[PDB]
Structure formats: C-alpha cells, structure tokens
C-alpha cells in the first residue's frame, strides 16, 4: 500500500535528451527519429522578436547540437509555431514508440528537467486549468519535455518555455502550440487564475480509501448541482456528470458513491481537515487523475 | 525556480530490473555484472522459515530468472544475510558504475518500483529515523531498489521486503542487511516511534527562502540548545552543531542565519502555519536533505 507522487519510468526520454546551442544560448531538444525538436528562443538573445526574420537569416551550421560526447549535424530546420525541428543526419537509436498528444488541464504528466542535454531529474506535474504548471526549472532547463508513458509508448505533452514572475511555468506541446494565453516573448504576462481540480481531488479521496485512510467519510450524500454550487463557492471546478462516469471503477473498488464522497469533500471544503491530514497531506490534492489512482492503487506497469 | 520532489532519473535502474520466479513466487532483482540480487523470500511458500535449510533444497534450476523476453539462466546461487545472489551465465550489458551503500536515517533515495521486472513509476523517499520508508509497494513489488546517482554512478542503498501494519515499509541495503529491527519473517513487528528530521525541514525552508516564501521568517534568533529543548517537545530529531555546519550554503546563498531559522522553526512549531504553505504545502517537511535542496535550488544534472 501507501500512496506517492509517482513519475513514469524516465529511461526511454533520457536517450532522446540532447543539448543545442545557437550564439551564446544553450537549451535542451528532443531528438526523434532524426529530427531534434527544441524550443525557438534558442536562435533568440527576446523583448521584441521577428521569430521569422531570425530563422531566415540562421543557417544550418549556426546550431550547435551536442548529443553528449558526438556533435550531431544538422541539415535543415523549421519553425512549426513556437518548437524548431531541426533534422539531422542521424536518427536516434534509442527512438522509442512516440506519440505527439495535446493534453487537457487536469491531466497529469511527468516531467524529465533537464540541463546541458543531461537528464537533471524526474517529477510529476499536472496541467492546471489556467494552463500553468508548477514544477522545478532554472536558467537552461527549457526544451526538457513532460510525458506520460502506456505500456512501450511515450506521449510527449510539454516542452518547457519560460518562467511566469508567480514562479509558475509555461510551456508548449510537440507541435509548437502554447498552451493558453503565453507567448514565447519578454513582455508582461501572467498565468490567470487557478482552480482547482475537482475530479482529482476525489480521486486522491477514493486514493485515501484504499489506503485506509476513513475519518473524512460519512454517511451523508447530496446531488451534484447542491455540490457545484459549493464547488464554486471554494474556487473548485465543476464537477460534471462525465467526471463522475470516470470516478466509477474507484467507487466501484471501495463500495462508496461518487456522490458520498461529493457529500465528504464538501464537509472537507467547509470545515477545513482540523488538525489531521490524507495520504501525509494537511491539503487536498488535485493533481492525481483517476486514471493516476488506479494505476497506482493496482500496480499497472510499463516495456 | 519551483520546488517539487524530484527523483533521480530512472534509466540507469530500469536496465537491471528483472523478473525473479521461484515455485509460486515472483519478484523482482537487481541485475548487476552477472549476479541477480533478489529478496531471499522468493524460496518460502513465511510464518517461521529457517531459510538455510530453504536454501540448501533449492537447486540453480529452481529459479526462473526473466529479464524480460530473455530467461537467464542462474549457475549457481549464495544467502548474503536477506539476499540472495544468484549468479548468472550473462553478465548484464546495462550493468553502470555503481556502489552498494548503506544510508543513515534522514538521507533520502529514489526508489523505483516495479513488478515482474517491469518499472512501475519512480518516486523520491526518506530512510525515516525509525528505519523505516513511506512509499508505494503493492504485492509482486519486492526486489524493488531505491538509490542515489552522483554524475555517472549509481548508488543502491534499498531493497524492498516487507509492509509493516502501519502501511510503512521496510527493507535492506544491497549487502542483505535489514534497516532496523525488521525480520523477513510474517512475524510480528512494528516500526518503532517516528521521529521529525530537523536538519531536513531547516533546509526545506531554505529551499523556500531562494524561491520567494519569506513569511515565516523573523528578526529572532536563539541557541542551539535552547531549541533544540523544543525539538524534543515536538518530537523533532535533536539538531547538531554538525548538522548547522551542513545547512551552511544554504545561509551561504541566503544571509540567513542557520540559528535565526532555527529561531523561525520555533515560531513555526510553536504556532503552526495558521492558514499558509511552505512551497505548496500546509505541513513542515522533512524529506529533503541539504543536499537535496542545492542539487534542485542549483541545477547538477548526471551523465
Ligand atoms: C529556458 O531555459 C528558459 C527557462 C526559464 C528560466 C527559469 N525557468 C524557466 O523555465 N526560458 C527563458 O529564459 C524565458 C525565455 C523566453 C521569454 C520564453 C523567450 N524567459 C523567462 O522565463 C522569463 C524571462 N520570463 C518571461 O519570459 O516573461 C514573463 C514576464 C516578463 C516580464 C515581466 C512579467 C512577466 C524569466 C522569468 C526568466
Ligand atoms: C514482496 O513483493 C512483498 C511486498 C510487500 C507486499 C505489499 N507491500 C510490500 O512491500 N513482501 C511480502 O509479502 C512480505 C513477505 C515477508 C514477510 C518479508 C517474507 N510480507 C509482508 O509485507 C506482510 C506479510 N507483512 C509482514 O511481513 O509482517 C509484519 C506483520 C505480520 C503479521 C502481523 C503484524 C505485522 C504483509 C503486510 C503483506
């Protein structure tokens, strides 16, 4: 038993994490087959920039891509939006099966942070519903991705791009699109305002259950308008009726219905935890999707 | 900037995991140079096993070693104390630099679980000072390790045996030595009073000064001895004067002296957080070693 903030397995990304430098700028590229996405400041040195008249006047020979101890080639680059494809002579042996995938807010994903090309460390992250995620990044980690992994197959989900002044982090999918309202430029923005996860967060109370962790239960329910209209009240999301379809196999495992456990987050959210916690949490926590739970409270693995 | 519990990247592990079958039990090992290290619970079928006249029954051909679509064929097998090495007729060629160590209480490892050989996820731990981890570990999870990486070399310091009734875990180093009072036997045993890291949660918050949580900060200060009298009080760890030599680039980057924190840990302890985190949390956290917080709060990556 026992419950963890669990990454994926990092072994198939750290074979695809290579270092690219372009003038006096050095970030982190994902190397695919032979096409090594990165981010597009690197060819910047970011108030006001053209992307478009700074990639036309680069050349192939201007970025420097380390892939360790070899120098790899490049032999021609594109801007897909805010990523350069910059394809090589030689395709990475330890390509794995990939997928490109645009994620959801709420949606959980581990993340590979990375310097000078070389894996830094693994920890898991969740797209928060302004499009923000909070994790661990300084000077030189852009281009380190976020991933999540099912069975032998690696869906890429983020590429760091820049630091919000809330110390919150903003990045793009692997087709170059931000995700939200941030654009890869030094001008004034910021993150908008968080919710919170409501879908996540009683998945993480059924996580409690299985683990034998009952006081925040009781024997009261309630209907999911009555819980919405206090969901809003907490700054938590809607739940909807699709949401509790997914909380399903968790209520089915442990007996208890999704709107119960609506009726104890609700006791929860009004009355605080009073001087305990859940799981080794004084807070609700809502960055485990169901599906998250389930993989952990019954031991899914991955090859 | 941010703040997560960040692993160590999982690649180096994932390549000696293996499976390890005996009779009706499967589990996982450790596959180093041509020795497969497993828990040496896989020849029981519990309650009182004298394991040498176990072992002594066994024969090489008794055990099913699977890394992955390869049988490994075992040549001979030996009980160091809790393990056993089963040595085998390839020697791995994922084998890394590595050391087997033996960690004291506070230290923290990543620790990468799996089943039947296959890497689950991968999660960040702390050997609590009743010699006990807090992880995630379903049945089939034993043989799972848990280690540091200092640039290229891997240092295995835990081997996964056993859940306490408390849903706490226990297990050995790599040498077959049980951390504390803890028996591979379904006797039982229970892990001993806990106790709070000190030198953990000053550098924890540390590691929110550099990030921007600077209220719970003061302008006092006090002695080592008149504090730690109220870490007894709160069952926290006594505090060194080697412990302060440790947490001193932390106020090295800072200007925060290690006896005001201490005097800001005070305040904090004697009145909680009265409604505000510390780095996304609402409780004092002690996972974190100083070494932990420069390696995250300064950016070393491995290679
Ligand atoms: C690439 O490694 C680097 C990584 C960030 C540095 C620390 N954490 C990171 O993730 N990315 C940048 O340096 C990035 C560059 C672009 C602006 C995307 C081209 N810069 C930032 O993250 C900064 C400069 N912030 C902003 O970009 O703008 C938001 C803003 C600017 C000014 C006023 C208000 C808001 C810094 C925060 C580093
Ligand atoms: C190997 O995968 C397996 C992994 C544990 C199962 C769930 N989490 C784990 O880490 N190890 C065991 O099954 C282990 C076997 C030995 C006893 C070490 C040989 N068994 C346990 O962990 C159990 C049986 N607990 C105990 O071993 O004893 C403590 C105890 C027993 C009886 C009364 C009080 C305390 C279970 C908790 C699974």
Redesign the interface.
């Given at each position: 038993?026992?419950?963890?903030?669990?990454?994926?397995?990092?072994?198939?990304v750290?074979?695809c994490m290579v270092q690219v430098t372009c003038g006096t700028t050095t970030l982190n590229g994902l190397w695919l087959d032979d096409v090594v996405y990165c981010p597009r400041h690197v060819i910047c040195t970011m108030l006001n920039p053209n992307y478009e008249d700074l990639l036309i006047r680069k050349s192939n020979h201007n970025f420097l891509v380390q892939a360790?101890n070899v120098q790899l080639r490049v032999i021609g680059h594109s801007m897909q939006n805010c990523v350069l494809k910059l394809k090589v002579d030689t395709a990475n042996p330890k390509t794995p099966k990939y997928k490109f995938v645009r994620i959801q807010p709420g949606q959980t994903f581990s993340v590979?942070?990375?310097?000078?090309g070389?894996?830094?460390?693994?920890?898991q992250?969740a797209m928060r519903p302004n499009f923000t995620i909070?994790?661990?990044?300084?000077n030189?980690?852009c281009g380190s991705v976020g991933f999540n992994i099912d069975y032998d197959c690696v869906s890429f989900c983020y590429m760091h791009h820049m630091?919000l002044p809330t110390?919150?982090?903003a990045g793009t999918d692997l087709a170059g699109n931000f995700y939200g309202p941030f654009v890869d430029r030094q001008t004034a923005q910021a993150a908008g305002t968080d919710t919170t996860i409501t879908v996540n967060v009683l998945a993480w109370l059924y996580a409690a259950v299985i683990?034998?962790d009952r006081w925040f239960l009781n024997r009261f329910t309630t209907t999911l308008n009555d819980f919405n209209l206090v969901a809003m009240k907490y700054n938590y999301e809607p739940l909807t009726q699709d949401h509790v379809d997914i909380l399903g196999p968790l209520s089915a495992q442990t007996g208890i219905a999704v709107l119960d456990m609506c009726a104890s987050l609700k006791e929860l959210l009004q009355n605080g935890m009073n001087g305990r916690?859940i799981l080794?949490?004084?807070?609700l926590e809502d960055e485990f999707t169901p599906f998250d739970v389930v993989?952990?409270?019954?031991?899914?693995?991955?090859?």
């Open positions: 038993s026992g419950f963890r903030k669990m990454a994926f397995p990092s072994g198939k750290e074979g360790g590979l942070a990375c310097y000078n070389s894996p830094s460390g693994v920890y992250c909070k994790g661990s990044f300084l030189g980690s630091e110390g919150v982090h683990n034998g916690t080794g949490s004084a807070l993989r952990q409270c019954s031991g899914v693995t991955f090859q």
